[PDB]
Design a protein around this ligand. Sequence first.
Ligand SMILES: [Mg+2]
Length: 185
Amino acid sequence: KTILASETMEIPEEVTVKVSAKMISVTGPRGTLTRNFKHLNLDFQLQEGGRKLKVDAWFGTRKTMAAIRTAISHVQNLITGVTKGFRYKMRFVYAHFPINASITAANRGIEIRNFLGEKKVRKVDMLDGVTILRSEKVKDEIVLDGNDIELVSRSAALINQKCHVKNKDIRKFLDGIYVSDKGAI
RNA sequence: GAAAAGCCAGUGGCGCGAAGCUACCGUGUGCCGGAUUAUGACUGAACGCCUCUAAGUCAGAAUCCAAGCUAGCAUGCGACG
Ligand SMILES: [Mg+2]
């Protein structure tokens, strides 16, 4: 019912955005990111020669109007991911059994052992654009690095949800792997 | 006639009895991918914040559909002699 709902962002001078009808390819110093917003039913248009991305919803109801800022902050996340990158920190909480993590192959996955005294060995492989490394200036962290927030955060979530404590009081047996500093550096 | 060999008693009766069938009373074997629910989540709005949800995604089960197993006159079809 609303004639025009538009939002706009700014593109820095280190990153090149190439939008192809909704197929957004972002290029930066760190690499390249890409995404289908081919489902959003919005209007993307670059102005000032690739320095301003301006998004329209014409006759958008409040639902489509809420869909706008998703696209704008998604492409913010791509811009920051491909200029600086995302780096999640993930601390080891263990009550009685030290849980012993070992990387898999050139930092593409982790292997958790001795969790809860269990003998099942926990194996998670990093998704495409994410790597892992054990923390060395911190006591017990694993630090994930990547250019894509979805890939970093999904890998973080796999590691988290693969160390749940079952059949026991989750209010007391707090063992697991949880994320502490989630910014982007 | 008798020994020998039998035969009659609907299978005369008993001991054993191969073969064939057979028994959890004996033996051998029984199944590999993906979708997903309940739930837990990721990025992220509406609502400068938050948010598993609105758009988009994930993990997920004696579940589901295949894979496998059985029939395949489905008046179906292919190669060839
Ligand atoms: Mg016998």
